[PDB]
Every structure is written in structure tokens, then in C-alpha cells.
Design a protein around this ligand. Structure first.
Ligand SMILES: CC(C)(C)NC(=O)[C@@H]1C[C@@H]2CCCC[C@@H]2CN1C[C@@H](O)[C@H](Cc1ccccc1)NC(=O)[C@H](CC(N)=O)NC(=O)c1ccc2ccccc2n1
Lengths: 99, 99
């Protein structure tokens, strides 16, 4: 459906057997979730945003359901004040901007 | 038109008599442009993103053309590595996410 932007575009994702709210971020290249326990092997990684860098744990081949749509991809876990769904998973579910 | 997200959603804006590329960011509450000269009176402001805070100059009632669509609103100028069009101006031009 058409999600307008008067308020933040938040949605519910299910990942790691848990339900969470997340922000559909067309400006985030990656998907970054708050600290949590995930099944798998991870690598350290450094990412950067407006204020500088944060170190996150990279997870690959993670199944994540975004509003009921299964998607598999790389998830970054770390100190983000808010769970962010980046363009990587959004393209998989078919999201897009309308102008 | 429907802007997909395989690559970054960049567009051309015209502001301050100049043409610039900017990112359509559904995850940014505000609009933040790289340091530039703007016509007006400004207030200092602190904003925060993934890595922490940055101090920006707030400008109000600024006319900014996004891909030819005039919009008037508050612009934040400061040390951002990339010009960001936030949800504030996007709602004015009628942008929205399609799921
Ligand atoms: C997540 C990551 C992969 C690191 N990518 C990014 O962070 C990219 C980096 C890009 C290049 C540098 C300039 C910014 C763009 C867009 N950002 C995405 C971009 O969408 C980013 C996502 C975000 C949201 C909340 C908190 C942190 C980060 N938004 C922001 O940084 C905007 C800044 C603004 N416009 O006011 N912040 C917020 O709108 C915002 C909202 C709620 C908050 C709650 C607590 C703390 C901070 C909060 N910040």
C-alpha cells in the first residue's frame, strides 16, 4: 500500500523469533537493528552516519519478515537508537518511492 | 514517477540559486544541506543521527525546488557528507513509500 510520510514510516518486523518496530529508511544503504541475539556467525564492521562511526556485527543470510513479507539478507546489529530497514532489504520486498 | 531503490534515490534540487544532488531520505525527520550561503536569519540547532550529534544552522521559510517542484520550509545547513531531503519537504511535494 501507499505509506505517506506525515509521520515516520514504521513497520513491524519479525526476526529472531521476535516482533519489533522498524523504520523504512530510503536513505540507509544498510539494515541496522538494535542489539539482540541472532543465530549465526558474524564479522565486525564499521559504518558511518551523520555523527560519525559505530561498530556493528554483520550477519548474513538472515530471514526477516517485514510486515509479513519474508526477505533474506545481511543484517547489522549494534547501538542504533532505532531499528532501520535499509535499501538492501527494501528492494527485495518491492518498496519504492513515488514522486 | 516510481523511483525504485536499487541505487540511492538522488535528485536535483535548486536552492540558493544553485543546483545540487540530494538524497530522498524517508528516515530523516529533517532536511539537512551541506555548508552553503543562504538568504536569511538563522538559529543554531543540534541534531543527532547514528553516530551522535552535529550542530547546524536552522533556516526557515526557504523555497527549494526538488526536481522542479517548489516547496517552502525549514532547511538545516551544516557538516553533512551528503545533502538530505527529509520527510518535512517530501510531504509537501507529495512523496510517499509504496509497499
Ligand atoms: C543507518 C546507516 C546505514 C548508518 N545509514 C545512515 O545513517 C544514513 C547515512 C547517510 C549519509 C550521511 C547523511 C545521512 C544519510 C542518511 N542516513 C540515514 C538517515 O535516514 C538517518 C537514519 C537514522 C534514524 C534515526 C537515528 C539514527 C539514524 N536519519 C537521521 O540521521 C536523522 C537526521 C535528521 N534528518 O534529523 N535522524 C532522525 O530523523 C532521528 C529520529 C529519531 C531519533 C531518535 C533518537 C536518536 C536519533 C534520532 N534521529
Amino acid at each position: 500500500p501507499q505509506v505517506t510520510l506525515w509521520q515516520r514510516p514504521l513497520v513491524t518486523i519479525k526476526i529472531g523469533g521476535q516482533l519489533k518496530e522498524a523504520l523504512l529508511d530510503t536513505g540507509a544503504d544498510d539494515t541496522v537493528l538494535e542489539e539482540m541475539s541472532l543465530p549465526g556467525r558474524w564479522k565486525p564492521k564499521m559504518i558511518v552516519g551523520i555523527g560519525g562511526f559505530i561498530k556493528v556485527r554483520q550477519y548474513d543470510q538472515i530471514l526477516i519478515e517485514i510486515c509479513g513479507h519474508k526477505a533474506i539478507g545481511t543484517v547489522l546489529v549494534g547501538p542504533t537508537p532505532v531499528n532501520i530497514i535499509g535499501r538492501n532489504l527494501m528492494t527485495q520486498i518491492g518498496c519504492t518511492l513515488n514522486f
